[PDB]
């Protein structure tokens, strides 16, 4: 893992995916940007490398599962050592591809260990964004109390938007039928 | 995860495990402390929360595999929500326990997939500390070019072949942290 402009672009990309209103994110405890400093951050006026470590890691902690933070670091290693990848796509897009390949690996090795659920997002005003993402985990990686060592987040980007069913088998089949629609 | 004093204590603990001489670590590119500022950092004079994000994450990147960085964050969630854990032990100690329990899980449920090898550490003077740690990974998690999605590091405080090195790990569970 390396903090740089690719990570700033990744944060801003994922912030826009989960948060309809930017202030629901940038006013969060641990992040707490003023309206002016937020705009400065979005527009390239603030070097993420020199920003406070707690603030940068709080933005990452909000947007990504801890396992996704490991995937970001592993994706960076692949990206910075592959000239074809750097030539063709920005880092955040490569990360989505790395993450999708991890899900394909889970589905291939043991589809029956793949579980999921709807994820919500806490806002600065003390409310929640319903259906912010689809949370996917390997059941065997359970850490107890709804925690999992291997866990990921996806967003449904289809026009069709096939309703995500509640029920273990129906959800696994939904995932398998919407692989091209989730990012 | 969360950057706080528990992480500063964790960095200092792991730095002491892998680096015989402190300057081999704190003078590294991307970390680059002066002798005076390192002393200030070491004895609570520098707030890690306010330090540069790239510097803090470079210290973490050196000391931990990216999968271990995920384990730190998951361990923090368990630790901050369990009053018995906070009462009895500091965070870094709990993290070693969380990590050890992850290894036991791999040995129990993914035994035929457990691979290992010697890890080396790059120093500020441009050389390598050859047997810095035992590297343990799940072969099926391979990312190509010696990279693995699921990978951990252990320090031995006390062998050729896959099932053999596996038996060494199983016989030295109490000797590694």
Residue numbers in the entry:
A (entry chain A): 1 to 183
B (entry chain B): 1 to 158, 165 to 183
Task: Kindly provide excerpts from the paper associated with this entry.
This new Acr, which bears no similarity to any Acr characterized to date, was named AcrIIA6. All AcrIIA6 and AcrIIA5 orthologs completely restored the plaquing efficiency of phages targeted by the CR1 system of S. thermophilus, indicating they are blocking the activity of St1Cas9. AcrIIA6s did not impede SpCas9, while AcrIIA2 and AcrIIA4 exhibited only a partial inhibition.
It crystallized readily and its structure was solved at 1.96 Å revealing a dimeric assembly. Gel filtration profiles also indicated that AcrIIA6 is a dimer in solution. Each monomer consists of eight α-helices and four β-strands forming a β-sheet, with the sequence topology α1α2α3α4α5α6α7β1β2β3β4α8. The superimposition of the AcrIIA6 HTH dimer onto the C.Esp1396I-dsDNA complex brings the AcrIIA6 helix 3 into contact with the two major grooves of the dsDNA. Helix 3 exhibits strong electropositivity, a feature observed in dsDNA binding helices, including the one from C.Esp1396I. We mapped the sequence conservation among the 48 unique AcrIIA6 alleles to the structure obtained. The dimerization interface is largely conserved as are the DNA-interacting arms of the HTH motif.
